[PDB]
Design a protein around this ligand. Sequence first.
Ligand code: 9DI
Ligand code: 9DI
Ligand code: 9DI
Lengths: 289, 289, 289
Amino acid sequence: MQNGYTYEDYQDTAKWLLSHTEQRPQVAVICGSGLGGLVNKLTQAQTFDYSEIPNFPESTVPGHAGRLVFGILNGRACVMMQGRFHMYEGYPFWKVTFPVRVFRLLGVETLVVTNAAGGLNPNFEVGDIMLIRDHINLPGFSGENPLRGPNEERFGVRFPAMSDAYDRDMRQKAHSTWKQMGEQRELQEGTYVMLGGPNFETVAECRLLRNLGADAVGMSTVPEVIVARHCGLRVFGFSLITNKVIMDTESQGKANHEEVLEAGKQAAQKLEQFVSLLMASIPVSGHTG
Amino acid sequence: MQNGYTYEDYQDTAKWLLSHTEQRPQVAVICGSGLGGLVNKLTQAQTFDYSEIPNFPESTVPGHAGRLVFGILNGRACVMMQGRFHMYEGYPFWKVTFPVRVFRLLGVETLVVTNAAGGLNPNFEVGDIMLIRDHINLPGFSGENPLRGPNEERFGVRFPAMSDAYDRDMRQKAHSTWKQMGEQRELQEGTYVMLGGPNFETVAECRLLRNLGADAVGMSTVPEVIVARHCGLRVFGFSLITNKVIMDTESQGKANHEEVLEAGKQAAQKLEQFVSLLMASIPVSGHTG
Amino acid sequence: MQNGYTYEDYQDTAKWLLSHTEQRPQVAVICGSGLGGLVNKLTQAQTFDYSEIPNFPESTVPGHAGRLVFGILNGRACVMMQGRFHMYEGYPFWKVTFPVRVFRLLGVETLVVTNAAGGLNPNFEVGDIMLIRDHINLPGFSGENPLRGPNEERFGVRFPAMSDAYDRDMRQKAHSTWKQMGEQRELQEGTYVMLGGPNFETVAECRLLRNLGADAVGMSTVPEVIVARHCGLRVFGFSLITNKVIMDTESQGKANHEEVLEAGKQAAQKLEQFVSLLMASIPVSGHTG
Ligand SMILES: O=c1[nH]cnc2c([C@@H]3O[C@H](CO)[C@@H](O)[C@H]3O)c[nH]c12
Ligand SMILES: O=c1[nH]cnc2c([C@@H]3O[C@H](CO)[C@@H](O)[C@H]3O)c[nH]c12
Ligand SMILES: O=c1[nH]cnc2c([C@@H]3O[C@H](CO)[C@@H](O)[C@H]3O)c[nH]c12
């Protein structure tokens, strides 16, 4: 059936975490494939395995550790999902996005989503960082949506708008911060398209997606962005272009999960630093003062 | 699993209605968001709340009253669904389309479907009435179809054609009737595309859908048109363009459910009159005479 | 839930077949709508109704006999599925593709898939044979995939590549063999697109699919190709263009299942001979010698 989680289920989980840590994060960060190293920048870190937290699902994908880590990143208190969940694991979207609603109940105001994606835009290179300015939700087109079923008014409204999903002011800041880093390669920005997986795309599917206007293709993030927005979380996200998708039948090679080599190795120090500097200020937003 | 309704389930429901009303409608009308006012033109009306009719599902969306109303509209006896069901409510297509098969068993010959839709075609304006000449069924592309599972030969054949879904002669009549109304704004006609919802589309999705050739986007109607056609019901339908979809990232605003303001208020008297005049004649079709 | 079949389920079924026949096929052939006649070329044939083989699903579509036939085709020992399964019958993809994994466990190395498809490419004619060089998996875009859920490492890896699904060397051979037949009509080759069904497409959907780059549209094959590739089966496939899809609203007619007339009658002797000659050699591939 539809969402099997009740409001109290999120309530209980949030209560469990609050009674087990003194940290009160405002920023929540989700780490995609091979981006699990973002965690080792945190100070005063406390790690919780998903399996010990009440209603939490579990990461079954290599590159996804399956741990919730609270810590202080460059002065700001945040919580990180070292590994996320995907629909191709057998998880329904209402299970995949469970942690987004828990964050909301913990008092989190901002959510930054990351992921590894295949490059569709020809100007993208392996190793590029693409700011997600927009997305195309293919599973959504068919009713596969985390918000399907009766609406929980306590989180948001029945018909939430998505045209303004990715925060404009945060994307301005990302660009400004990149300049300060002195990166030779420019900061990319585009549309992220989500499909189910777990197999990689055929040439025809890559050409089709590109013609639809997508810049990168992945198998996650979008459900989370929808639930986040629905409950009023400010959102920002970026894709690490781990590979160039096959656009020709004269296939030199084929995609493979070794793309973690591009993330948790190749572009480790870069985006980890990019995200740390990014914790400069929402500006915070703490009522007054 | 697939369709949980047996032929007898539709039989029973049809029998219940027939033994509770003296009205024998030939035309069935389904009212979409904010079009619930079409009901108050009926004479000798008898209302049934969906909750009292045996195997009937229930409308949970504001703008959808959830009542079956029998009445006489401009001389013709018809039955109206004051509010429909959607997949985003958690309803499977076989539940969403239940009433279409009941209508067939009541003796109904024509079904007119209405709905509120976002305008993709740039020449459309808020308040426009678009005749549905065709549709694109996105959920259908993935197997999400009201006819999935074993086929009930008593209703129709296994592989029904959809290329001739929207009656040609009725669309000629709609245009002729519009002329007689003296409307300054021309009568629109286009392709309706259905997606799951309940969130509104992103700019990228709107551009994608437009490039696919769709004129308006909605979250209903199509499943109903398929089941109707499958059982031999003549079909006609139109969309009330309640809003202009966001096609640019320089987002002035965002879509919201207040679009009922455009329907159940703004274009009330117009389409209600358009539908009343439309009950001129199939010509009826009553064997001979 | 996800795949309800365990590795032992495939093991058991493979064992059952092996202890009931002396034939050890290397090639497996799947027959689509109206192509069931490919079976009557086999020598030393042994037929098994799907209903008698342990974990086997059942064909409910006319044109699909529902029998597993072992035999010798032009010198090569093979097994044939006289009739396949489709998602529109109510079958989940993990049920639809069950036989592909059984074949793998029997020792099969090559799988040739066939099907009846509607022509999108304007240069195609009814009766044409199209080599499947690639595919677009619409249900896959939304997570509807035979590999969803935990991965069985004993069959393949979590993220299998699909860009090289259709064997290049076998498609070279198909072209060479066609020349030897002396066919006046050239051998077609293109992209196959899969959608759910069971209804036929609207004009708008046909134009949409064509613009996406598809040459033929069908309601099967793809799930099977994915599971096959995942477990290392060499794959080759072709579509019998049974009809021209409706691309204009000035609809002369509409599609219907009578397309079996084009297959199991019209192009019977041709493709049956084409497939028999095609059993020339992988070259076999039998370790050494
Ligand atoms: O080219 C790609 N296509 C689709 N998904 C991905 C990913 C993402 O990485 C994981 C697999 O490595 C998946 O979880 C997927 O979403 C990276 N590259 C691609
Ligand atoms: O722009 C739009 N996009 C998608 N659906 C709708 C609707 C339709 O109205 C209800 C929500 O107001 C939904 O039921 C939807 O199908 C109107 N406008 C749009
Ligand atoms: O034009 C077509 N569109 C979609 N599917 C098919 C088939 C295939 O044949 C069976 C129905 O005859 C279905 O099983 C379908 O996959 C043939 N032609 C078309």
